Design a protein around this ligand. Structure first.
Ligand SMILES: O=C(O)c1cc(N2C=C(CCO)NN2)cc(C(=O)O)n1
Ligand SMILES: O=C(O)c1cc(N2C=C(CCO)NN2)cc(C(=O)O)n1
Ligand SMILES: O=C(O)c1cc(N2C=C(CCO)NN2)cc(C(=O)O)n1
Ligand SMILES: [Cl-]
Ligand SMILES: [Cl-]
Ligand SMILES: [Cl-]
Ligand SMILES: [Cl-]
Ligand SMILES: [Cl-]
Ligand SMILES: [Cl-]
Ligand SMILES: [Cl-]
Ligand SMILES: [Cl-]
Ligand SMILES: [Cl-]
Ligand SMILES: [Eu+3]
Ligand code: NA
Ligand code: NA
Length: 129
């Protein structure tokens, strides 16, 4: 599923991501735009052989099981395919674990490089939330 901007903002808010660990909703929408273009079916292979999955490009090196990342962990206790669903629940619940691990949203390199320190509220401007 390819979400609309406000559509994704509303889903993320409903699932408790607005201000989670202090990150306002716009930060999460910005991250998703540059990680996946709001497409839940996004995948990308990393140089180390792990793969990133879903709207927030969650990595199989640590967070999910894809059966093809030797030596990896599955800290969200989910198949990586769950992260591609039209329902963002699994991605949101896993993102909450990620952002709580100590480095906040710097875990998302695209957030650090394209969202951090920018006017992220622009990403939710005009939405009925
Ligand atoms: O493709 C776009 O740029 C786009 C698509 C959008 N939508 C909205 C929907 C309907 C939601 O139910 N689907 N794509 C919304 C926006 C935007 O708010 O800038 N932009
Ligand atoms: O309606 C939109 O949400 C929308 C329209 C866009 N455009 C761009 C053009 C060309 C110039 O007028 N026309 N609609 C571009 C985008 C976007 O990149 O998010 N969004
Ligand atoms: O005007 C739009 O259609 C629009 C503006 C957006 N943004 C993003 C920013 C932040 C920095 O450029 N400001 N407006 C994002 C989107 C979209 O994702 O469809 N659409
Ligand atoms: Cl929308
Ligand atoms: Cl915001
Ligand atoms: Cl594996
Ligand atoms: Cl393969
Ligand atoms: Cl594990
Ligand atoms: Cl599994
Ligand atoms: Cl959803
Ligand atoms: Cl933080
Ligand atoms: Cl990570
Ligand atoms: Eu648009
Ligand atoms: Na906000
Ligand atoms: Na699993």
């Amino acid at each position: 599923k390819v979400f609309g901007r406000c559509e994704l903002a509303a889903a993320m808010k409903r699932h408790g991501l607005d201000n989670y660990r202090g990150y306002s909703l716009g930060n999460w929408v910005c991250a998703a735009k540059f990680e996946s273009n709001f497409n839940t079916q996004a995948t990308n292979r990393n140089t180390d052989g792990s793969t990133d999955y879903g709207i927030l490009q969650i990595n199989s090196r640590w967070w999910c099981n894809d059966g093809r990342t030797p030596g990896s962990r599955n800290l969200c206790n989910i198949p990586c395919s769950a992260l591609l669903s039209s329902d963002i629940t699994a991605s949101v619940n896993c993102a909450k674990k990620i952002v709580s691990d100590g480095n906040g949203m710097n875990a998302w390199v695209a957030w650090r490089n394209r969202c951090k320190g920018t006017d992220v509220q622009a990403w939710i401007r005009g939405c009925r939330l």
